[PDB]
Design a protein around this ligand. Structure first.
Ligand SMILES: CC(C)CCC[C@@H](C)[C@H]1CC[C@H]2[C@@H]3CC=C4C[C@@H](OC(=O)CCC(=O)O)CC[C@]4(C)[C@H]3CC[C@]12C
Ligand SMILES: CC(C)CCC[C@@H](C)[C@H]1CC[C@H]2[C@@H]3CC=C4C[C@@H](OC(=O)CCC(=O)O)CC[C@]4(C)[C@H]3CC[C@]12C
Ligand SMILES: CC(C)CCC[C@@H](C)[C@H]1CC[C@H]2[C@@H]3CC=C4C[C@@H](OC(=O)CCC(=O)O)CC[C@]4(C)[C@H]3CC[C@]12C
Ligand SMILES: *[C@@H]1O[C@H](CO)[C@@H](O[C@@H]2O[C@H](CO)[C@@H](O)[C@H](O)[C@H]2NC(C)=O)[C@H](O)[C@H]1NC(C)=O
Ligand SMILES: *[C@@H]1O[C@H](CO)[C@@H](O[C@@H]2O[C@H](CO)[C@@H](O)[C@H](O)[C@H]2NC(C)=O)[C@H](O)[C@H]1NC(C)=O
Ligand SMILES: *[C@@H]1O[C@H](CO)[C@@H](O[C@@H]2O[C@H](CO)[C@@H](O)[C@H](O)[C@H]2NC(C)=O)[C@H](O)[C@H]1NC(C)=O
Ligand SMILES: *[C@@H]1O[C@H](CO)[C@@H](O[C@@H]2O[C@H](CO)[C@@H](O)[C@H](O)[C@H]2NC(C)=O)[C@H](O)[C@H]1NC(C)=O
Ligand SMILES: Nc1nc2c(ncn2[C@@H]2O[C@H](COP(=O)(O)OP(=O)(O)O)[C@@H](O)[C@H]2O)c(=O)[nH]1
Ligand SMILES: Nc1nc2c(ncn2[C@@H]2O[C@H](COP(=O)(O)OP(=O)(O)O)[C@@H](O)[C@H]2O)c(=O)[nH]1
Ligand SMILES: Nc1nc2c(ncn2[C@@H]2O[C@H](COP(=O)(O)OP(=O)(O)O)[C@@H](O)[C@H]2O)c(=O)[nH]1
Ligand SMILES: *C(=O)CCCCCCCCCCCCCCC
Ligand SMILES: *C(=O)CCCCCCCCCCCCCCC
Ligand SMILES: *C(=O)CCCCCCCCCCCCCCC
Ligand SMILES: *C(=O)CCCCCCCCCCCCCCC
Ligand SMILES: *C(=O)CCCCCCCCCCCCCCC
Ligand SMILES: *C(=O)CCCCCCCCCCCCCCC
Ligand code: NA
Ligand SMILES: [Zn+2]
Ligand SMILES: [Zn+2]
Ligand SMILES: [Zn+2]
Ligand SMILES: [Zn+2]
Ligand SMILES: [Zn+2]
Ligand SMILES: [Zn+2]
Lengths: 546, 546, 546
């Protein structure tokens, strides 16, 4: 109903005045809160992070004097050593080999072990070797004098097999400068900045400590940073990485979006010719001379500079913070988990029978028995088979959640439970019990005696006659609930019989949890039925409430 | 104060010995833990993942014999069929159309339906058609014999409208090989590796099962993988993707960082000429012949290979694991939520009056009544309007949280509550009540009788005279709290009057929660006031504690 | 054991029938659930998001009539104004400066302030100025007539220092069109789509409202969108961004994967010549004329269009949803936290002694005293030093968890605690106490009197003689636990002495929590020992249970 909707259940708690557990709780809480705040700040988990969208524009500056045997000196400019390719990459030629006046004809292949032939049997027509730039014609030919090489259809004259020039022809390229303009955007955050800000000094060169924001880089300085030697790499070439990292906080109070520049060689420093070490490409200049298409083939060596731009932009997001806080909230209940585990363990008797005698430092932790007693109440499943049995000659109570397979309940011994400390037949050991008058199937239930060993019956006790058999007590108990009650003698006697069973069960078992499922001894049962007999019929006996 | 800071509140709990609920709890816990661990391992939620920073370097190898009508055979090398463009992409020419000796002049446009004119009226001076590479001059001209085309300023001779050659001139390009060198970095994790490791066989070609780590790829094999036909795509061209995936675990014990190679065609397999199918571009060779700038225009068809490199690098992060664990901790309380929901539902009487008679399989779930009784205590808001009423002729108690609008409290019937089973006037049905002597506004409160229907007054009960009106009982109760108390007769009588109200309320209502807000019947009230009258003045009556 | 494994502990709770707290709980729950669902939907936190892998293919269409003084008109096509560079970028030449017939020789440098020399002293041999494309030879030379410039080895004739042409020679480039084909993939989700779908109109041009899905873009329209003027940027050049955003939901029921096109200028709108404003590059055409390698140097101005493709693809992931729900579950316990905080504060007496008299609106919140009483039970650490003391002349009880440094326990006054309202020597103020017969070290414990101020001893009370000293009461209490008990007179007397201590402690302190650690007054102690003396020996006294 409506009145049941507007309810609030609060947990019943026990507040413990303990230095140890209070200190533990607050230590746990402070550590957890400090780590939670530290993780939040360090990893900026309150921030939504957006990857950087980058655009790079490079401007390489520098001229080189190049000396080639012919000896002639020439000046190379950007139009000569730079091949406009990309923005996130630029290439600087550092060396070259020139093959001039090539033509599509038949020519003697350059002398090599795979090529040098003695007769036409050492060459197959149409053979396309992976190591040739030509297709075999089948016949050997004189490359020069004694040398006999396999003729091949290709661009001719064939390239000479020669290593790259040493020293590199554009070794002066380490003195070249590149200006890098990097525009970045965070479209989700709608933020864009660039690496060159107004007022930045433009006549500087980058230095990681002196000028770490000058976007002008000397290539030799890049190689020094990486520990690589420009002169060596210039010969055969390579690939260098210019990393631009953007750790950008777009919170206006803590705003910072500047690049960090780092350098990384990207080509393997290998000498395995099978792997094509360095960085080179064959680039052909075409020109029409003598009404024929010609080719100046240049094997271009150089260094490709890859501009690697990466990073994130963070701005405060409520949802991210909420998610993080919710992911951290359950950690504050671990103090309770730990302390409750301590209360549950140290309440165990084992911790005192064996441990404390050995480790006498832990004895003061016996207070957890009191804490557990005040904290936890143990209850059993109220099953129809549940029965509780008390013997006056025993200090404990037996729980029998076990079917009686025709066995006397006196002989069925179940697990012991402690009594709440509020403060003729063969199975009879008191000589005051009578056989059960129930159906034989259910007769074993009442085959129980007040005592496990021979002795005096509990019926002979004073308190049995004052508590259980006193008409005044039972009448008072009945009137307390029904003050004006008036019943026939038989109905009243039945009520007093029930109240007497109740009184015995409460007296010997205590809690109604046990007294509800208690079983009266035959002696007490039949004494009560003698004090309050029914006019007619037979007694139903124990009927479990569930 | 300080002593209040060092406190620990533990929750009071009820431990249930139940097979069903213990099994349910442990089943829930095991399932939740297993799923939590499985999710953690599978998605590596203990790891901080960094996107890969990639650098690609390609080396295409292969020569092609090209036959063009003129019939002449020529050998194409990389310098011829490759246009150095990028690292994450390479292009292989597969076909071409050559237009030689172009000049900037006035020329007859190539015959087309849009172009063919009969007179100068079919061409507008300065017209720039989207389908022309020229600007109209206004006059028709003879392309050849009868053909009359619109003269146009453009590069001349104009290109012939011809499809790409079939078969492709560089069909042998499927036999070409590309070596891909991929360098990757995880700057946050400070890890870099490359796809070619020392010892990798260099004379292999990639195969997805035999050699899935050879970075040398035959282009035809790529197309076979994709199910595309190289011969067909070579004619008009296309775009192929070489995907390099890096699933890299940088935990040293479980370290693995190798690439997975896959292939994906990236151009639409369309035949819509409006959409410019394939991949072609017009590239012009410039040469000075006859002291004039000329142009050999080549329509270059071929396949662009895009190298797509993606992936993540994971290394264990404490913060990520902490966040995940905290996000999973609350799921362990769902067993408690579920079982408490079961206890709350199955405690409902509805589950037994109607359900169990129908579904007799659920009857053993009646134990939840006991569990709920041992688990939950219901309390009401102690409002000034709160009043509890008990009639001896009823087995229940009425709660009246409702203002008395001049109505007798006997006539005001509130909702019924069950009594805690601890074990002359017109509105009078017992003939022992007197009218209220309070102000008329507050007189209706005491207009209550001990019984709802005619009968004997509860004052005639024995227990009323023994519990409520016995001087010994009240004196004992007062001395129990104040052993040495001694008061004037009037003060003592007032104390006994209060204690008698208390005794009636406790006897008929039980818990002080109800007895505090109980209302004594007029009969009992005035009998008590007769047994313990005050010397002078009038009786204040009921004063709610709140 | 096994029976202890199959247990379920449920929390004991108090259900409060309160409009205020029920409404607060449900308001909290509804707000939290609504925000949780809103965050989930808005941020799609049930989805695993994959970054887009993009491939771009551009096709620029348009021809321009170019007029250069010589005055001659020429038609430029793609082969002329487009430099095949990349897919994610395309370049359109908009202006150029041509330097024809350059040769590698010695030439007079172009007149500038840094260059103009009067004699050979104004030029250093081999000097490589950053602003020169040549290397100084050391001698001045006549550029023209009076002008004297420093001779320099370079490509000659040296380029004239001239601004870019105004108006731009390819100003008609704003009428050019580019078709952008964008293929995207989500490899984890195994989804690929493209921006051109079947049925898309191909004769349109993009408009942000009319045709926001036409992938054909007029460049001038892009600049209008950005608010930039194409004519101005065409002169010196620039960089424009075409952003393609993919917000793609790959859930089939809510599936949508289409691009959003936006435009952003990427070059800084700077006029600082040091920063190389615009976008230009020097591109050289090489031709062999007169058996010499020549160079037509073109300074190419134009606009680079960067195609920026970004976005995510989301598909439902169970793990992500589970993580989010778990991160949100603990927020539902904040209603309980808040209401329990309210119960804990408003139970404070301070809220009534001072606050309510001032703020009389809060008085009805005094019910939290009742709620806290029904919710929280406070217990103390049962330390060996813990002792409770009650004086009959005081209404409260004193807790002494403090060692007695030879001080009489009567003089040691500890903190006050309220009694559970169940309902000759110098330190003696009643004249019935005797000195302690314990060892002097432990004698101060029993140096306690029944009353703090002079008066009658509690032993003179009737209830002391009826409850504590009545043999019947104690015998009944002993038989209630041991009905058939029979002991020697000395053992029985010891049992009655213990039970009398128990009865006094229970009567004056109540709960066994206090009565366990209570200290009997010397008067009561010795009266009890007189009523039940031991045959021989001395009395041990108080022994703390812990
Ligand atoms: C870790 C747990 C235990 C405690 C939770 C701490 C939070 C209260 C902190 C974490 C991140 C903090 C935020 C970090 C960044 C910002 C941005 C800041 O705004 C700006 O800096 C920009 C101002 C502008 O928008 O113009 C305002 C404070 C705020 C929201 C902070 C408010 C306090 C927050 C939410
Ligand atoms: C899912 C819930 C219920 C249980 C939590 C399980 C954790 C205890 C697991 C999850 C991930 C595990 C980690 C996975 C990876 C590593 C890296 C491993 O280190 C290495 O492999 C590299 C060693 C090196 O650093 O040189 C050390 C163990 C550790 C921290 C593991 C420790 C155990 C962890 C934290
Ligand atoms: C926010 C808290 C308090 C409540 C949790 C809500 C969930 C039950 C919602 C959140 C996201 C929802 C999902 C969003 C998307 C989908 C995909 C949908 O499948 C499709 O659309 C594609 C069908 C196909 O696979 O072919 C099926 C429903 C499902 C799983 C939804 C089921 C209901 C979900 C898990
Ligand atoms: C950097 O590289 C250059 C070129 O490889 C090294 O100089 C060469 O060193 C070898 C061995 O001594 C000589 O035979 C060559 O004649 C040198 N060439 C030049 C250009 O002088 C140079 O030594 C390397 N750097 C360092 C520091 O060792
Ligand atoms: C790719 O290379 C293979 C191997 O050279 C070619 O197949 C050969 O083709 C010739 C001419 O038809 C035959 O004489 C050979 O017997 C073939 N060899 C094998 C092993 O089959 C193939 O034609 C080439 N493909 C293209 C498109 O050029
Ligand atoms: C792969 O593509 C080639 C070229 O389109 C196909 O070969 C052509 O097929 C048509 C139809 O039979 C013939 O008219 C042409 O003469 C063929 N050209 C060549 C080069 O032979 C080839 O059939 C396609 N692959 C497959 C398996 O069908
Ligand atoms: C867009 O740019 C063009 C070129 O800069 C501007 O046209 C020039 O404007 C100046 C100043 O009035 C004149 O001296 C030039 O002769 C103009 N050039 C041309 C090509 O006409 C134009 O004004 C700019 N757009 C707007 C709207 O101001
Ligand atoms: N706990 C308990 N209850 C009993 C016992 N014997 C009888 N009762 C209760 O007494 C009632 C039956 O009374 P009884 O004299 O046995 O049968 P009756 O004469 O037919 O009413 C039922 O409510 C039983 O639960 C017993 O040994 N233990
Ligand atoms: N629960 C309850 N308390 C009552 C009732 N009548 C009086 N009291 C209490 O008795 C005290 C007043 O005593 P009373 O004889 O009514 O008035 P007095 O003579 O002025 O003291 C107050 O503490 C009341 O709360 C009643 O019907 N029910
Ligand atoms: N709470 C409490 N227990 C007491 C006090 N005096 C004695 N006892 C208990 O009584 C028992 C000792 O009885 P006592 O006559 O003092 O000594 P005994 O004659 O050697 O047995 C122990 O269990 C004590 O805890 C007292 O003042 N307070
Ligand atoms: C007598 O019964 C003493 C036995 C104590 C058993 C508890 C042992 C404590 C060690 C931890 C056991 C639980 C695992 C917790 C892992 C963090
Ligand atoms: C007896 O009850 C002693 C129990 C004490 C439990 C503490 C066990 C060590 C764990 C300490 C962890 C927190 C650091 C110390 C807090 C002061
Ligand atoms: C008599 O009162 C029996 C009525 C039982 C009502 C409970 C019905 C159980 C079905 C679930 C209802 C709550 C929704 C839970 C969704 C997971
Ligand atoms: C009466 O109290 C029976 C209640 C039993 C509750 C179980 C209802 C079915 C839900 C089971 C979910 C867990 C799987 C089975 C555990 C053994
Ligand atoms: C008398 O004792 C009244 C004092 C009340 C103290 C409580 C003050 C309430 C304000 C909040 C204090 C706790 C911080 C909560 C932050 C959200
Ligand atoms: C006395 O016990 C009054 C306590 C009332 C607590 C409410 C204090 C204000 C916080 C309200 C937050 C939720 C919105 C209002 C719910 C109806
Ligand atoms: Na949580
Ligand atoms: Zn017997
Ligand atoms: Zn017996
Ligand atoms: Zn009446
Ligand atoms: Zn009456
Ligand atoms: Zn004294
Ligand atoms: Zn005294």
């Amino acid at each position: 109903s409506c009145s049941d909707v507007f309810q609030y259940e609060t947990n019943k708690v026990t507040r413990i005045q303990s230095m140890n557990y209070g200190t533990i709780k607050w230590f746990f809480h402070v550590i957890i809160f400090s780590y939670v705040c530290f993780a939040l700040v360090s990893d900026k988990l309150y921030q939504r992070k957006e990857p950087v969208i980058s655009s790079v524009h490079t401007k390489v500056k520098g001229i080189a004097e190049v000396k080639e045997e012919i000896l002639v000196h020439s000046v190379f400019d950007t139009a000569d050593y730079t091949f406009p390719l990309q923005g996130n990459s630029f290439f600087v030629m550092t060396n070259f080999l020139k093959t001039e006046g090539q033509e599509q004809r038949l020519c003697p292949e350059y002398p090599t072990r795979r090529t040098l032939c003695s007769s036409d049997r050492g060459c197959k027509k149409g053979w396309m070797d992976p190591q040739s730039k030509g297709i075999q014609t089948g016949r050997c030919v004189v490359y020069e004098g004694n040398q006999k090489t396999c003729e091949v259809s290709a661009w001719c004259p064939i390239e000479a097999v020669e290593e790259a020039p040493r020293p590199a022809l554009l070794n002066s390229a380490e003195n070249f400068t590149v200006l890098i303009k990097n525009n970045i955007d965070f479209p989700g955050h709608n933020y864009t900045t660039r690496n060159i800000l107004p007022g930045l000094n433009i006549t500087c060169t980058f230095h990681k400590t002196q000028n770490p924001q000058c976007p002008i880089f000397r290539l030799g300085d890049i190689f020094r940073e990486t520990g690589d030697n420009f002169s060596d790499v210039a010969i055969q070439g390579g690939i260098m990485g210019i990393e631009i990292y953007w750790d950008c906080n777009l919170d206006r109070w803590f705003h910072h979006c500047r690049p960090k520049y780092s350098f990384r060689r990207l080509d393997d420093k290998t000498t395995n010719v099978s792997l094509y070490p360095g960085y080179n490409f064959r680039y052909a200049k075409y020109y029409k001379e003598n009404n024929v298409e010609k080719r100046t083939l240049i094997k271009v060596f150089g260094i490709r500079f890859d501009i690697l731009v990466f990073g994130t932009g963070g701005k405060f997001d409520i949802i991210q913070l909420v998610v993080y806080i919710g992911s951290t909230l359950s950690y504050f209940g671990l103090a309770a988990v730990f302390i409750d585990f301590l209360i549950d363990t140290y309440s165990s008797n084992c911790c005192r029978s064996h441990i404390y005698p050995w480790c006498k430092c832990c004895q003061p932790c016996v207070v957890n028995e009191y804490y557990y007693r005040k904290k936890c109440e143990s209850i059993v499943e109220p099953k129809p088979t549940l029965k509780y049995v008390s013997f006056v000659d025993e200090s404990h109570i037996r729980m029998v959640n076990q079917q009686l397979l025709g066995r006397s309940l006196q002989d069925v011994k179940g697990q012991e439970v402690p009594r709440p400390a509020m403060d003729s037949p063969v199975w009879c050991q008191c000589g005051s019990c009578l056989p059960s008058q129930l159906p034989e199937s259910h007769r074993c239930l009442e085959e129980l005696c007040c005592r496990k060993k021979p002795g005096a019956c509990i019926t002979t006790s004073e308190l049995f006659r004052k508590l259980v058999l006193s008409r005044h007590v039972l009448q008072f108990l009945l009137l307390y609930q029904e003050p004006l009650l008036a019943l026939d003698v038989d109905s009243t006697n039945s009520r007093l019989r029930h109240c007497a069973y109740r009184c015995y069960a409460t007296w010997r078992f205590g809690s109604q949890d046990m007294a509800d499922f208690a079983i009266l001894p035959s002696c007490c049962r039949w004494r009560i039925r003698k004090e309050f007999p029914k006019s007619e019929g037979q007694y139903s006996g124990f009927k479990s409430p569930y």
